[PDB]
Ligand binder design. Sequence first.
Ligand code: BA
Ligand code: BA
Ligand code: BA
Ligand code: K
Lengths: 407, 745
Amino acid sequence: KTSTLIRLVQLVVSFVSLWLTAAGFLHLLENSGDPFFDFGNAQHLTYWECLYFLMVTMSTVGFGDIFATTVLGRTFVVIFIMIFIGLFASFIPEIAEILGKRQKYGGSYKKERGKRHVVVCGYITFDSVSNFLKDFLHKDREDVDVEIVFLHKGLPGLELEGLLKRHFTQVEYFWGSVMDANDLERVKIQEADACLVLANKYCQDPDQEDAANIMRVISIKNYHSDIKVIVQLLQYHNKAYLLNIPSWDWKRGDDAVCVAELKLGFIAQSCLAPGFSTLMANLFTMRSYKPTPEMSQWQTDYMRGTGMEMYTEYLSSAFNALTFPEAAELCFSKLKLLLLAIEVRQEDTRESTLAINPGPKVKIENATQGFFIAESAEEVKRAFYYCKNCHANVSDVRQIKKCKCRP
Amino acid sequence: KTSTLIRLVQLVVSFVSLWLTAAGFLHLLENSGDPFFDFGNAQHLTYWECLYFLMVTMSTVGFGDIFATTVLGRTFVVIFIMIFIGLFASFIPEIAEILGKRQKYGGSYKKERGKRHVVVCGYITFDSVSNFLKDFLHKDREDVDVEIVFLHKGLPGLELEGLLKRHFTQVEYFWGSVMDANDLERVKIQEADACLVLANKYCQDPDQEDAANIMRVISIKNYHSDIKVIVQLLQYHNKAYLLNIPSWDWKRGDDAVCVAELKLGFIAQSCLAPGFSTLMANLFTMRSYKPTPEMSQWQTDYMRGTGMEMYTEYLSSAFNALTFPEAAELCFSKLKLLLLAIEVRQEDTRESTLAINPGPKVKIENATQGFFIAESAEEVKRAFYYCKNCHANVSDVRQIKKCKCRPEPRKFDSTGMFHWCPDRPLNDCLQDRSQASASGLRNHVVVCLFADAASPLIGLRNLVMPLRASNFHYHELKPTIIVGNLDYLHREWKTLQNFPKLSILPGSPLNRANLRAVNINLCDMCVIVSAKDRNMEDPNLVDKEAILCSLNIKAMTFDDAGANVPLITELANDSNVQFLDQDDDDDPDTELYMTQPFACGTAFAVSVLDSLMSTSYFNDNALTLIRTLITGGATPELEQILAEGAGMRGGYCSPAVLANRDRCRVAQISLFDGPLAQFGQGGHYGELFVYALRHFGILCIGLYRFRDTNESVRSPSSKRYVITNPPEDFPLLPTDQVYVLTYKQ
Ligand SMILES: [Ba+2]
Ligand SMILES: [Ba+2]
Ligand SMILES: [Ba+2]
Ligand SMILES: [K+]
């Protein structure tokens, strides 16, 4: 069911048929004889041997084992060579065109039983993926591994090919688009964990790119209506077009990331407090502390603070009926851990608006969620396992990491 | 007589001559001897054998039977190989170029004795031919087969090649143009039945394409002056340039099909009666009813009405001296057949103007022609063979198929068919949000226009002209408000200033403040049109604005609700209809006419109009009837008036002209609380039809019915679908609506 395959099979079948016809012609003309010599020079020649000889002659190689002694055989060989060279002169271009037509990056993704993947569509180039790939597949992240399935309408460049080859065990690529209900089955969106729509930050008209990304979101939500979508927008007024999509529910994970809003917000916060942009940019990126002797003292001091990230954790029962300043002081002094924000309304079930540095009025209740700044996720667990009675006399922070006499 | 052939024969002859010269050289140098050896090593060698050996050596193959023992022979062979390889290095490019020069699609068409063909010229691509080819070569059509001969200046693509191969037995292709008197003899226009000139609906400047098509028509009529031509135009003002051609006679079959006029007429008729666009689009396309078990009940009910077409037939002698209502009632009750229109003046020989649902005054005379809606052409024949005496006691309709024993200061136009107002400047109608909200607009029409400043004109006149017909009372006129770009409206206002009750709100339709000021929740129809240029990007990203506007209007909430706003969307690509409705199940190879948005009368695409070229060829009265239905007038006299460049003109009319204010119009009625509401409960379609025809003089075309079967609870998706001419035993519901053809205003 392919025109190229049909043409290829047609030409190969015609070539085989003509080759067999020529083999029969030579067999007859060699086993018959010569009218000039009254058929006194005919030489025995099997059909297989004649076919072998003609394949040798046609393949431009030429051997000296079988030759046409008969004059009729010689002139038939000359006609064979001339006609087949003439045909091959007008036959190689179509074959060359067809042999370089099948796309390299087809096929359908096959998922394992216990492996989750996220689909990454949109504007896939080297500069729009390198940082995202570096953060997504960072070594310092937890042991949970999730695959990445790029789905783009185009062929990757050289450096993108290098990135794909280096991450061969975690990254797959496919040719297609999110505008086709057929391409959304090759990447298994019905079972995908999330869909990430990237954008082109250096386009000519931001409105057109934003509309295209909104159309991609519309298509994805039209195919499957309960998947989590993270969109990358350019302008801020286009953030309201995503509320019109009936299946776009913010409460279940759908998010929109506005480039201009975040960038100018970082700059405007640097205006009020200089140096805040780098603080914010380093708190929200996965980095590891690897000091080297070639680094100056201030470089080491800065790199130590660079490697700290932000995490979330459920406060233990020891924080109940305790105000925010006391909880933060206890976390810093004992657990050596900084607490920024809390969940204030996890009890009344009203979306639990975040509270950043609340006053003494706010009190920690049961099963609240807090936000910590820590070097790694392991250190945050001490807040969950902290019991006041058993850990009263514990000095080293390496012992609080383990629970004690939990009910 | 070809330069390429001359070059080829020159090179092959030179090669043969050089080959023979080399053969002679080797023969002489081998049979002579060697001066160093005193000619003591010469070996006998015939000329034929030497020629064979040199052909083997030159052909890069190489055998080991004949070899040049002589040193002179060996050095001559070396020189031969070197010189001929050097020559062949500089000889293959020209040969390769020449061998790929002859065009594949030349030649002349040869016609059989009894086969007729139609020539199809113009803009031949895959998307402009697929629907036309599907309709023209439909299986359900009669046994008469006519060939198609495409004539284009270019090579077909891949999918066009596939179409040609699939229809190999009915379709031919040729390279040429209708601008050459030589190419019109290769396709035999002197014997062709008709010439179909297609257009490019998505061009950059419609005027240039229209002028090119007019030039093609001029050439075709210049070559042969008595051939039938069906032209496909884009704008409406170019329809008057075809009257200047001396050989263009409308009375003999020449026709012009205007894309914009028909499309905007369908939309404007949907504005008055929702869901009419799909009814009209399905009545004028060849379809077949092939139900499948996977289809839902409402899908089968809709597909049964989809398969009905329209035909013409001569009424039998039994209809003589019988008025139109009685004839229609007899046709429906006995023959199970619906009669729409009649020929009123076939006797006086005055072009026999069509009559749609005439009053009791009109009487059927001998040898009249009538128009029927029927599943197939066989059922229409019962009208011709119906004899009252012999078929009096015939119950089954399968026996009638065989014959038996046959022997107020109102200002209108000059034509008096449209409402007219004196010319005004644009600022006399321009408004802002405060002024628009001050005016309590309700039951109006809102046109959301996504136009640029330099975008080509749509011709919004064709959308407002049907809404100002003179058969509407001045208090029944629906106010129209256009929300869109302003510079485009400066360009467009030249053709709109004469229509009363029209307003413009500059801005953008995607803004919500405009839609709140316009009172879009109290309107009767919101038409989303886009004048922006088409097809510079992915085909799936050409209808961003329309889909975004539809979703924005649907998601909006008003104060007593935004999902009940009736709006009709115009699509550039027909594959985007999957993104309009959420409750439906999408599918990639489903035709547009079978989707849910189209079945409800919400989406419309110009592709469904591609089938209007074939029908106009097979039925010459179809275009007149469809224009009469979807335009509300526009007689050729009005076209002549507009062709003078002075614009629309008129005023107070004489009483003789004002007699044109009584033509029938398409309307929609409800079975809820009217005088005929008794058929809502337990009633059947046939009883309602005959009652309405006998009592009120109303002809019913079809039903417009809630999609959800549980209308008692009225599921949130309150969408309706259309059924065309349901059978006589169809059960009615109190919430169903009926399409009707009303008379006497
Ligand atoms: Ba770290
Ligand atoms: Ba049919
Ligand atoms: Ba859908
Ligand atoms: K070679």
